[PDB]
Amino acid sequence: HMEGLAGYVYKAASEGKVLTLAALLLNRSESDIRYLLGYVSQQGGQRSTPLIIAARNGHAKVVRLLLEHYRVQTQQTGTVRFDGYVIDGATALWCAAGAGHFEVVKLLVSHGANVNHTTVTNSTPLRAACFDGRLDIVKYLVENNANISIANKYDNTCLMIAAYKGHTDVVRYLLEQRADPNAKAHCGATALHFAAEAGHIDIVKELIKWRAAIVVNGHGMTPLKVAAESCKADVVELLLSHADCDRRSRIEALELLGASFANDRENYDIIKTYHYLYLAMLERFQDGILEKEVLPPIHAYGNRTECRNPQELESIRQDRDALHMEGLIVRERILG
Template structure:
């Protein structure tokens, strides 16, 4: 494609984007019909969007520009990628964009021109759904009057009525109901429009849906709209529901107590006064009639400081001004009512733990966070953020000199093993709700966090912690026997980590990451304790079975990566220790990467070269493999399978007296 053609396409696109209709007409009117189609079908990537001229003009509401483009018969259904409210929308049509952006005039033009009013995006969102999301009743009416289907749901089976209810657009909800929208349709999560309206606090919409005979059902977690509203601190919705005659006394009590407990636990809507108010109302309701409804007796939870829920109005009154007790009361109530398998239970537990951490009460923080971690993993909920959060607080404790016990560190390291195994399983066999790209991101994050935790676990197992004033390593009072047991447990867990065979998109194993200077270190406390490359971690991984000859996507082995370390003098011990550990672990020094380079070729400093040279020993097996590769001797199917893999490690290249590819003499210096 010529530069002149490129310039013309850019001019057409930007004239469309800026609404310069006269310039647009001048550019297109002098071109042939075929050239116009080509110019208008172009896709320009800009600001994270990939748009055609028609789509960007429609997106920006430039009616005159759209009218001009329509004269040249563009493809009305050509899809693009756009951004709306922070969301990336793939497969959007010009009509979808105009509807979502609220440009009624453009919507009318496109529909009159023959645009498909039900053209879905990749997630099956229609132009009507986009208008419902934005609450544009005028566009909703126009589209439905021109055959837009109000019953088309997106890939989550979320309908137009649901999104309007969720966003709080009462007029749109009323209109859709009048057209026959089904209020009892259920999304894949089990929620209905009533559920969405209730949990978002839209009491008027709740009333409207109930007037249209919406049923009170439970979502996949067993939550009714009333319970969902209470959990989200939607007091208006709760009070509306409990005023209805079809709500039982037991349901009323649960809702009031959960509402109060949530006000004491919600980081965004925290209000201790409202918490006590609704907890008190719930307790009084228990004793409001002759048949008292006593609280069920449940075993106290250690993470909640073994708090036993108040059983009477007097007991609750006694802790009214004791915020610590009210907080534990609230966490216990939430877990009792919602159940330990509800994914909403852990969030306030984590929040309360963070408050303890901010006040240097690390013991209580860890108790709460470990409880939340166990709940989430038992429900197979992602804990990628939780694992990193633990690494951060562990590092903070070590850095400031607070004693850190081994057991919680080891438990979190064990949890990392389980999480990596689950990540790999989901990538291999994703479920209907799994986004593979997201899971791959999480796996990579969990691998790096796992390395942080190994470094921390090794330090704690040895009974060492950093003193904040001198930053020296000082021993704790642990016995030598305990230290030995703890180190053995670390080895066992690291062995399981290695056995997970987790790799990043770039093919990096845990050992690759441990020796790679470019492996990222989180800068929230973690960087005070962890750094890469790490000789101790690399040696431990090798001891626990990590392959020293594993190759990444570019055929680099861990040895290829460490020899590029740019601190050969200031951190000589790390460089030397890792190279020696790899070689002693069986690393092949003549393995070639994708560029045909051996580790010796990849060395960026003379120090690394010297270390390699001093360790090089001629190996007849390696030389034979290299000869086979150099001369193209057929070997597949002629030798045992394990030898095929061994020969593959050795690529072609001239071998000098050290068994290394010859280097430019100018590179052979310190």
């Protein structure tokens, strides 16, 4: 029967074999060609239609054919795979967006394809392109009325995801397209928070260029605190040339930043620990007065207590071991 021929059709489409395809759906009845073109094939949890697969694989030839001659539905939904995981509620356009197949995308759009369709997780194809970072698609999608405000299931904006990856060009474009930089997320995060977690110094600039608010994480984390805790020394410095709470925010960020050099085994630099830890102690001690509420010793970090005065810190400067502990103690205080 036809569940067999259906594959032979799904095959050709997936592989871009436009000739094989065309030959396969000639002298076929309209009732038949609809069945074949709409069949949903499962190739490893991947439920897809011929259109959808060819759109996912960048087979413009096959894609043009399906649309021009056979005039298959542009809204066919499906469940496709991308680098391991499988997304649900996808249209050909969604696959072509995140797969960077600009040629396929224009063609899909030019043949009247919903640019604002929302997958199961409510992910615009624009969202896909902002993840991928194929700026031309982004531009072109936006030029064809793709709504930027549409976030995801968790209120992750296209702006955020781009700030997560390093897509400085895309972020800047979205900002000019007036994407709200102060959008918040379920976890209570801003594009600024994300790029601050990464070390996306260029993007953190543009957000600041665009008067991004300093909000708090659902954890109670400024973008600064995030970056200092994520051990992104540069970002911290930049972000600190702005309206940081006079001393409290500042000293904490420095204290945490320096502590994050003892904890983080990737970036591990104790010298940088004492540098920032001693810096912060100074900010604490120029008016004498801002003072440290120190926690009691514990077995966890040796029966040690954090330093409260510069002289206490100055003594540790040469004790690689003691400094390692201090950073832990310090981080323990600021975070818990």
